[PDB]
Amino acid sequence: MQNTVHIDLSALNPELVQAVQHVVIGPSSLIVHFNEVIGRGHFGCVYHGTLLDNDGKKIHCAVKSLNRITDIGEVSQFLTEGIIMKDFSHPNVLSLLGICLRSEGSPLVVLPYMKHGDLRNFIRNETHNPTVKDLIGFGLQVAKGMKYLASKKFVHRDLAARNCMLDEKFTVKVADFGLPVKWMALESLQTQKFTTKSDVWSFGVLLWELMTRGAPPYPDVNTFDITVYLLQGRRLLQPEYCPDPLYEVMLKCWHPKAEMRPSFSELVSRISAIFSTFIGEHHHHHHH
């Protein structure tokens, strides 16, 4: 039976097993609400969970699991995805609470609960209807998380609004570190190589998603035609209501020459200046 699977930790790579050992969560401290699904995927599911802290306090968490495990490579990939967050510590980067390894069944990757889910769905909700200034603020928070990640020589590879989460204080947490063709830098589409400058390209697409309230980019351009479309110099167009200086920032992020793109440090400074000079309505705090 599927619930009797036993994972041989001896079969995982050396660096990986060492990292997992540092973040183990004892099973008696975790309650997974297996009947309260946060999100369902083909390979895994995310459930609400409750962790008991060292003083008996309850901590609301999200717990990811694999649906069916047949091979060690699947397990390795799943654990690598959780452990990647381990050594980062920044208000705009999602943290890892730990990994629970019961004698049988899938390992469980335990993350902080994000009340507002992913950024893309949040901005698409008419009942949220974020102001232009708060959308700029969310872009500033993402840039701050990416400036931190870049400083650690970390390349995300899959930066997009769907991969950023929002907590109960509207703090954006970059997550789901890396086919997302429409977010990829021209050079990545041609060489399959990724760098901090290709993350800058993707960041520009994420900013466009913010300013369009979650519109899909290049909806009419087939995925297999994107490279040529971009080589012809075409780019996503200025969204309605998007301030001119912010669109100039997006255009800079999509320069065909990686070396000409701004760094994330430069993007933080520029966006922060735009945020501070756009005097409009806003309800959230973005200056972590």
mmCIF file of C-alpha atoms in Angstrom:
data_model
loop_
_atom_site.group_PDB
_atom_site.id
_atom_site.type_symbol
_atom_site.label_atom_id
_atom_site.label_comp_id
_atom_site.label_asym_id
_atom_site.label_seq_id
_atom_site.Cartn_x
_atom_site.Cartn_y
_atom_site.Cartn_z
ATOM 1 C CA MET A 1 0.000 0.000 0.000
ATOM 2 C CA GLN A 2 0.922 3.543 -0.803
ATOM 3 C CA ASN A 3 0.967 4.519 2.914
ATOM 4 C CA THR A 4 3.658 1.956 3.797
ATOM 5 C CA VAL A 5 6.373 3.409 1.540
ATOM 6 C CA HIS A 6 9.735 3.449 3.290
ATOM 7 C CA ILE A 7 12.426 5.875 2.114
ATOM 8 C CA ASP A 8 16.004 4.759 2.350
ATOM 9 C CA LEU A 9 17.837 7.909 3.452
ATOM 10 C CA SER A 10 21.110 6.088 2.537
ATOM 11 C CA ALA A 11 19.984 6.475 -1.099
ATOM 12 C CA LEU A 12 19.969 10.292 -1.070
ATOM 13 C CA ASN A 13 23.049 12.385 -1.954
ATOM 14 C CA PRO A 14 25.564 13.330 0.824
ATOM 15 C CA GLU A 15 25.099 17.092 0.868
ATOM 16 C CA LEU A 16 21.301 16.662 0.769
ATOM 17 C CA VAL A 17 20.951 14.239 3.661
ATOM 18 C CA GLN A 18 23.296 16.389 5.800
ATOM 19 C CA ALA A 19 21.151 19.466 5.172
ATOM 20 C CA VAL A 20 17.885 17.664 5.951
ATOM 21 C CA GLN A 21 19.327 16.465 9.284
ATOM 22 C CA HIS A 22 19.671 20.058 10.432
ATOM 23 C CA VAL A 23 15.976 20.841 10.001
ATOM 24 C CA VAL A 24 14.126 17.723 11.112
ATOM 25 C CA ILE A 25 10.723 18.150 12.772
ATOM 26 C CA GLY A 26 9.674 15.356 15.171
ATOM 27 C CA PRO A 27 6.329 13.834 14.142
ATOM 28 C CA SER A 28 4.717 14.407 17.535
ATOM 29 C CA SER A 29 5.129 18.162 17.053
ATOM 30 C CA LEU A 30 3.221 18.340 13.796
ATOM 31 C CA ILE A 31 -0.459 17.929 13.021
ATOM 32 C CA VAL A 32 -1.211 17.797 9.285
ATOM 33 C CA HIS A 33 -4.852 18.711 8.485
ATOM 34 C CA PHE A 34 -5.027 16.206 5.673
ATOM 35 C CA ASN A 35 -8.641 17.120 5.042
ATOM 36 C CA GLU A 36 -7.850 20.844 4.608
ATOM 37 C CA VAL A 37 -6.102 21.218 1.242
ATOM 38 C CA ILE A 38 -4.435 24.540 0.412
ATOM 39 C CA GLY A 39 -3.378 23.476 -3.093
ATOM 40 C CA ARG A 40 -3.368 20.343 -5.196
ATOM 41 C CA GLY A 41 -0.823 19.433 -7.868
ATOM 42 C CA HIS A 42 -0.281 16.323 -9.971
ATOM 43 C CA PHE A 43 2.722 15.214 -7.943
ATOM 44 C CA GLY A 44 2.002 16.794 -4.575
ATOM 45 C CA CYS A 45 -0.524 18.486 -2.310
ATOM 46 C CA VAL A 46 -0.177 21.290 0.242
ATOM 47 C CA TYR A 47 -2.264 21.070 3.435
ATOM 48 C CA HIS A 48 -2.926 23.280 6.378
ATOM 49 C CA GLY A 49 -0.891 22.160 9.396
ATOM 50 C CA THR A 50 -0.262 23.027 13.043
ATOM 51 C CA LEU A 51 3.184 22.827 14.674
ATOM 52 C CA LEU A 52 3.609 22.809 18.415
ATOM 53 C CA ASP A 53 6.466 25.072 19.502
ATOM 54 C CA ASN A 54 8.871 24.535 22.367
ATOM 55 C CA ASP A 55 6.473 26.179 24.797
ATOM 56 C CA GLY A 56 3.331 24.499 23.549
ATOM 57 C CA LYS A 57 2.168 27.324 21.283
ATOM 58 C CA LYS A 58 0.459 26.488 18.036
ATOM 59 C CA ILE A 59 2.015 27.727 14.850
ATOM 60 C CA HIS A 60 -0.105 27.643 11.651
ATOM 61 C CA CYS A 61 1.908 26.197 8.786
ATOM 62 C CA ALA A 62 1.551 24.815 5.262
ATOM 63 C CA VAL A 63 2.750 21.220 4.751
ATOM 64 C CA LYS A 64 3.739 19.895 1.298
ATOM 65 C CA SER A 65 3.702 16.134 0.559
ATOM 66 C CA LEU A 66 4.231 13.902 -2.484
ATOM 67 C CA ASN A 67 1.085 12.083 -3.624
ATOM 68 C CA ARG A 68 2.610 8.835 -4.809
ATOM 69 C CA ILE A 69 6.203 7.852 -4.395
ATOM 70 C CA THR A 70 7.731 5.221 -6.634
ATOM 71 C CA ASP A 71 11.381 6.260 -6.897
ATOM 72 C CA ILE A 72 14.200 7.816 -4.949
ATOM 73 C CA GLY A 73 14.834 10.522 -7.579
ATOM 74 C CA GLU A 74 11.349 11.981 -6.945
ATOM 75 C CA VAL A 75 12.093 12.120 -3.212
ATOM 76 C CA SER A 76 15.487 13.704 -3.786
ATOM 77 C CA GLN A 77 13.986 16.436 -6.001
ATOM 78 C CA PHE A 78 11.210 17.151 -3.502
ATOM 79 C CA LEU A 79 13.603 17.445 -0.549
ATOM 80 C CA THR A 80 16.097 19.531 -2.566
ATOM 81 C CA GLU A 81 13.257 21.986 -3.284
ATOM 82 C CA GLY A 82 12.597 22.357 0.453
ATOM 83 C CA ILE A 83 16.162 22.510 1.667
ATOM 84 C CA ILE A 84 17.133 25.253 -0.809
ATOM 85 C CA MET A 85 15.506 27.864 1.498
ATOM 86 C CA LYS A 86 17.344 26.692 4.536
ATOM 87 C CA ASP A 87 20.283 29.077 4.552
ATOM 88 C CA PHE A 88 18.547 32.255 3.452
ATOM 89 C CA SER A 89 17.162 34.739 5.897
ATOM 90 C CA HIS A 90 15.436 37.776 4.410
ATOM 91 C CA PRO A 91 11.938 39.232 4.988
ATOM 92 C CA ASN A 92 11.170 38.855 1.258
ATOM 93 C CA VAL A 93 12.352 35.271 0.827
ATOM 94 C CA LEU A 94 10.184 32.329 1.963
ATOM 95 C CA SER A 95 11.726 30.422 4.903
ATOM 96 C CA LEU A 96 11.648 26.678 5.646
ATOM 97 C CA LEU A 97 10.243 25.592 9.036
ATOM 98 C CA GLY A 98 11.529 22.038 8.658
ATOM 99 C CA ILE A 99 11.087 18.536 7.248
ATOM 100 C CA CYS A 100 9.177 15.735 8.992
ATOM 101 C CA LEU A 101 10.234 12.167 8.099
ATOM 102 C CA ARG A 102 7.830 9.560 9.546
ATOM 103 C CA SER A 103 8.833 5.894 9.379
ATOM 104 C CA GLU A 104 6.500 5.416 6.385
ATOM 105 C CA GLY A 105 4.955 7.745 3.810
ATOM 106 C CA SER A 106 6.083 10.880 2.057
ATOM 107 C CA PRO A 107 8.519 13.288 3.768
ATOM 108 C CA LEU A 108 6.622 16.458 4.648
ATOM 109 C CA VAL A 109 8.151 19.885 3.871
ATOM 110 C CA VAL A 110 6.786 22.415 6.388
ATOM 111 C CA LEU A 111 6.592 26.081 5.451
ATOM 112 C CA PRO A 112 5.179 29.195 7.096
ATOM 113 C CA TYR A 113 1.461 29.688 6.311
ATOM 114 C CA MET A 114 0.862 32.443 3.755
ATOM 115 C CA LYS A 115 -2.623 33.818 4.416
ATOM 116 C CA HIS A 116 -2.911 35.534 1.063
ATOM 117 C CA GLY A 117 -1.561 32.806 -1.168
ATOM 118 C CA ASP A 118 0.302 33.605 -4.370
ATOM 119 C CA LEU A 119 0.762 37.129 -5.613
ATOM 120 C CA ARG A 120 -0.773 36.464 -9.013
ATOM 121 C CA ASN A 121 -4.054 35.251 -7.638
ATOM 122 C CA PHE A 122 -4.126 37.990 -5.031
ATOM 123 C CA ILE A 123 -3.883 40.799 -7.599
ATOM 124 C CA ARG A 124 -6.431 39.180 -9.873
ATOM 125 C CA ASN A 125 -9.122 39.282 -7.145
ATOM 126 C CA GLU A 126 -11.603 42.132 -7.645
ATOM 127 C CA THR A 127 -12.304 42.252 -3.932
ATOM 128 C CA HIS A 128 -8.664 43.065 -3.316
ATOM 129 C CA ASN A 129 -8.332 45.552 -6.212
ATOM 130 C CA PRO A 130 -4.919 46.734 -5.086
ATOM 131 C CA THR A 131 -4.015 50.349 -5.699
ATOM 132 C CA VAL A 132 -1.364 51.224 -8.221
ATOM 133 C CA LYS A 133 0.979 52.300 -5.366
ATOM 134 C CA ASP A 134 0.597 49.005 -3.536
ATOM 135 C CA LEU A 135 1.315 47.106 -6.814
ATOM 136 C CA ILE A 136 4.516 49.163 -7.138
ATOM 137 C CA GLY A 137 5.251 48.345 -3.477
ATOM 138 C CA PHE A 138 4.873 44.587 -4.140
ATOM 139 C CA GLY A 139 7.362 44.953 -7.033
ATOM 140 C CA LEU A 140 9.773 46.767 -4.630
ATOM 141 C CA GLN A 141 9.452 43.883 -2.111
ATOM 142 C CA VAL A 142 10.239 41.302 -4.811
ATOM 143 C CA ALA A 143 13.249 43.331 -5.941
ATOM 144 C CA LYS A 144 14.507 43.424 -2.310
ATOM 145 C CA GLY A 145 14.195 39.658 -1.978
ATOM 146 C CA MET A 146 16.042 39.199 -5.300
ATOM 147 C CA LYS A 147 18.769 41.698 -4.340
ATOM 148 C CA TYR A 148 19.394 39.481 -1.275
ATOM 149 C CA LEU A 149 19.342 36.266 -3.311
ATOM 150 C CA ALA A 150 21.686 37.707 -5.965
ATOM 151 C CA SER A 151 24.118 38.773 -3.213
ATOM 152 C CA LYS A 152 24.356 35.064 -2.283
ATOM 153 C CA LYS A 153 25.054 34.181 -5.943
ATOM 154 C CA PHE A 154 21.683 32.438 -6.020
ATOM 155 C CA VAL A 155 19.860 32.190 -9.375
ATOM 156 C CA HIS A 156 16.085 31.703 -9.098
ATOM 157 C CA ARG A 157 15.364 30.572 -12.670
ATOM 158 C CA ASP A 158 11.561 30.741 -12.281
ATOM 159 C CA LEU A 159 10.726 34.220 -11.030
ATOM 160 C CA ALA A 160 7.026 35.025 -11.750
ATOM 161 C CA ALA A 161 4.078 36.445 -9.767
ATOM 162 C CA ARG A 162 2.695 32.890 -9.281
ATOM 163 C CA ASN A 163 5.925 31.978 -7.416
ATOM 164 C CA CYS A 164 5.770 34.809 -4.838
ATOM 165 C CA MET A 165 3.577 34.377 -1.756
ATOM 166 C CA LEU A 166 1.903 36.981 0.458
ATOM 167 C CA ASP A 167 1.625 36.710 4.247
ATOM 168 C CA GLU A 168 -0.946 38.190 6.611
ATOM 169 C CA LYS A 169 0.983 41.494 6.798
ATOM 170 C CA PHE A 170 1.164 41.656 2.955
ATOM 171 C CA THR A 171 4.864 40.831 3.003
ATOM 172 C CA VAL A 172 5.844 39.277 -0.319
ATOM 173 C CA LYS A 173 8.009 36.150 -0.041
ATOM 174 C CA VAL A 174 9.920 35.009 -3.130
ATOM 175 C CA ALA A 175 9.464 31.227 -3.369
ATOM 176 C CA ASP A 176 9.351 28.140 -5.624
ATOM 177 C CA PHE A 177 12.918 28.445 -6.829
ATOM 178 C CA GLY A 178 13.588 26.833 -10.215
ATOM 179 C CA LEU A 179 9.852 25.746 -19.499
ATOM 180 C CA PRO A 180 8.358 29.035 -18.199
ATOM 181 C CA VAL A 181 9.143 30.370 -21.649
ATOM 182 C CA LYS A 182 7.277 33.652 -21.480
ATOM 183 C CA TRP A 183 9.264 34.772 -18.435
ATOM 184 C CA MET A 184 12.703 33.689 -19.763
ATOM 185 C CA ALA A 185 15.535 36.020 -20.876
ATOM 186 C CA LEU A 186 16.337 35.921 -24.576
ATOM 187 C CA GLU A 187 19.747 34.320 -23.938
ATOM 188 C CA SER A 188 18.173 31.666 -21.693
ATOM 189 C CA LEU A 189 15.740 30.737 -24.449
ATOM 190 C CA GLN A 190 18.669 30.311 -26.831
ATOM 191 C CA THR A 191 21.300 28.731 -24.572
ATOM 192 C CA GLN A 192 19.337 27.211 -21.684
ATOM 193 C CA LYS A 193 21.758 29.007 -19.338
ATOM 194 C CA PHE A 194 20.490 31.126 -16.406
ATOM 195 C CA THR A 195 22.146 33.932 -14.491
ATOM 196 C CA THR A 196 21.250 36.803 -12.150
ATOM 197 C CA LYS A 197 20.768 38.918 -15.310
ATOM 198 C CA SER A 198 18.229 36.427 -16.677
ATOM 199 C CA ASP A 199 16.431 36.663 -13.283
ATOM 200 C CA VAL A 200 16.363 40.454 -13.930
ATOM 201 C CA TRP A 201 14.582 39.823 -17.272
ATOM 202 C CA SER A 202 11.979 37.637 -15.460
ATOM 203 C CA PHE A 203 11.611 40.327 -12.794
ATOM 204 C CA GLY A 204 10.632 42.788 -15.504
ATOM 205 C CA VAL A 205 7.910 40.345 -16.631
ATOM 206 C CA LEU A 206 6.765 39.998 -13.000
ATOM 207 C CA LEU A 207 6.498 43.815 -12.775
ATOM 208 C CA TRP A 208 4.342 43.819 -15.919
ATOM 209 C CA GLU A 209 2.125 41.123 -14.350
ATOM 210 C CA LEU A 210 1.748 43.355 -11.304
ATOM 211 C CA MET A 211 0.815 46.441 -13.298
ATOM 212 C CA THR A 212 -1.707 44.542 -15.468
ATOM 213 C CA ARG A 213 -3.299 42.939 -12.387
ATOM 214 C CA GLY A 214 -2.166 39.484 -13.414
ATOM 215 C CA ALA A 215 -2.692 39.424 -17.160
ATOM 216 C CA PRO A 216 -0.959 36.588 -19.049
ATOM 217 C CA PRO A 217 2.032 37.895 -21.005
ATOM 218 C CA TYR A 218 2.082 37.643 -24.834
ATOM 219 C CA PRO A 219 -1.228 35.653 -24.807
ATOM 220 C CA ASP A 220 -1.355 35.522 -28.645
ATOM 221 C CA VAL A 221 2.259 34.465 -29.189
ATOM 222 C CA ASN A 222 2.837 30.742 -29.250
ATOM 223 C CA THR A 223 5.459 29.512 -26.816
ATOM 224 C CA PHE A 224 7.525 28.139 -29.698
ATOM 225 C CA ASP A 225 7.568 31.573 -31.355
ATOM 226 C CA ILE A 226 8.650 33.693 -28.388
ATOM 227 C CA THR A 227 12.412 33.648 -29.140
ATOM 228 C CA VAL A 228 11.915 35.091 -32.626
ATOM 229 C CA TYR A 229 9.327 37.603 -31.432
ATOM 230 C CA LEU A 230 11.897 38.940 -28.945
ATOM 231 C CA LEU A 231 14.779 38.958 -31.467
ATOM 232 C CA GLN A 232 12.646 41.266 -33.607
ATOM 233 C CA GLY A 233 12.878 43.704 -30.659
ATOM 234 C CA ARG A 234 9.227 43.483 -29.590
ATOM 235 C CA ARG A 235 8.389 43.662 -25.890
ATOM 236 C CA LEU A 236 5.388 43.654 -23.595
ATOM 237 C CA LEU A 237 3.535 46.965 -23.946
ATOM 238 C CA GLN A 238 2.950 49.582 -21.251
ATOM 239 C CA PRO A 239 -0.049 48.621 -19.156
ATOM 240 C CA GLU A 240 -2.835 51.104 -18.790
ATOM 241 C CA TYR A 241 -2.339 53.265 -15.634
ATOM 242 C CA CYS A 242 1.279 52.114 -15.199
ATOM 243 C CA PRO A 243 3.487 55.107 -14.433
ATOM 244 C CA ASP A 244 5.863 55.992 -17.225
ATOM 245 C CA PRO A 245 9.036 55.715 -15.074
ATOM 246 C CA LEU A 246 8.111 52.167 -14.019
ATOM 247 C CA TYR A 247 7.619 51.059 -17.624
ATOM 248 C CA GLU A 248 11.082 52.469 -18.403
ATOM 249 C CA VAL A 249 12.340 50.170 -15.617
ATOM 250 C CA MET A 250 10.607 47.166 -17.242
ATOM 251 C CA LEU A 251 12.158 48.018 -20.629
ATOM 252 C CA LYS A 252 15.622 48.181 -19.013
ATOM 253 C CA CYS A 253 15.077 44.664 -17.578
ATOM 254 C CA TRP A 254 14.440 43.302 -21.084
ATOM 255 C CA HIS A 255 17.577 44.722 -22.764
ATOM 256 C CA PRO A 256 18.749 42.107 -25.303
ATOM 257 C CA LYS A 257 22.234 42.341 -23.809
ATOM 258 C CA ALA A 258 22.395 40.830 -20.302
ATOM 259 C CA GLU A 259 25.295 43.051 -19.295
ATOM 260 C CA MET A 260 23.221 46.213 -20.024
ATOM 261 C CA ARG A 261 20.425 45.221 -17.610
ATOM 262 C CA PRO A 262 20.310 46.818 -14.205
ATOM 263 C CA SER A 263 21.382 44.857 -11.183
ATOM 264 C CA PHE A 264 18.807 44.078 -8.478
ATOM 265 C CA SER A 265 20.500 46.624 -6.215
ATOM 266 C CA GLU A 266 19.922 49.252 -8.909
ATOM 267 C CA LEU A 267 16.331 48.063 -9.334
ATOM 268 C CA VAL A 268 15.671 48.416 -5.615
ATOM 269 C CA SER A 269 16.988 51.979 -5.673
ATOM 270 C CA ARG A 270 15.038 52.938 -8.803
ATOM 271 C CA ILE A 271 11.769 51.407 -7.731
ATOM 272 C CA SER A 272 12.060 52.797 -4.282
ATOM 273 C CA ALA A 273 12.478 56.276 -5.799
ATOM 274 C CA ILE A 274 9.410 55.740 -8.021
ATOM 275 C CA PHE A 275 7.380 54.487 -5.054
ATOM 276 C CA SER A 276 8.396 57.469 -2.920
ATOM 277 C CA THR A 277 7.464 59.985 -5.623
ATOM 278 C CA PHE A 278 4.114 58.464 -6.680
ATOM 279 C CA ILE A 279 1.727 60.116 -4.266
ATOM 280 C CA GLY A 280 -1.308 57.866 -4.350
ATOM 281 C CA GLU A 281 -3.492 55.748 -2.130
ATOM 282 C CA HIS A 282 -1.846 52.764 -0.447
ATOM 283 C CA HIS A 283 -2.738 50.405 2.328
ATOM 284 C CA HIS A 284 0.295 48.130 2.772
ATOM 285 C CA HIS A 285 3.785 48.492 4.200
ATOM 286 C CA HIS A 286 6.560 47.697 1.819
ATOM 287 C CA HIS A 287 9.729 48.942 3.465
ATOM 288 C CA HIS A 288 11.033 45.873 5.250
#
